[PDB]
Amino acid sequence: GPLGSLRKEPEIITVTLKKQNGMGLSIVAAKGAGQDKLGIYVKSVVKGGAADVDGRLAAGDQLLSVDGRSLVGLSQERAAELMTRTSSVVTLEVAKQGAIY
Numbered sequence: 001g002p003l004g005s006l007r008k009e010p011e012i013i014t015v016t017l018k019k020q021n022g023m024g025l026s027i028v029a030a031k032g033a034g035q036d037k038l039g040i041y042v043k044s045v046v047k048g049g050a051a052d053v054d055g056r057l058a059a060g061d062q063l064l065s066v067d068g069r070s071l072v073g074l075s076q077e078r079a080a081e082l083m084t085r086t087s088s089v090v091t092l093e094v095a096k097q098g099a100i101y
């Protein structure tokens, strides 16, 4: 598949270990259980990591796929298990919604 570079649109995004101190990011998935909703979201950067300081992701980015795993819309229990081991770069797929405020 193709890949861009940087733009404020729904796409593949990739986040290198620029300063090696882990990624330092924050995500939340949902499921089709207790509420009807499903999905994944970048809740924040963690204000202290390599993918935080040089990836500078936005609060609210609706995540869909994960490094080594093209999920296209499935919950973190089969994806954050891969992302945590990354050691060098997360590829991701996201869609800009919400803001900091």
Ligand SMILES: O=C1N=C(S)S[C@@H]1Cc1ccc(C(F)(F)F)cc1
Binding pocket: 022, 023, 024, 025, 026, 027, 042, 046, 049, 080, 083, 084, 086, 087, 090
């Ligand atoms: O903050 C973190 N950096 C890591 S390395 S593991 C931990 C949890 C975490 C993993 C991946 C993501 C990401 F890449 F944003 F999906 C968020 C949080």
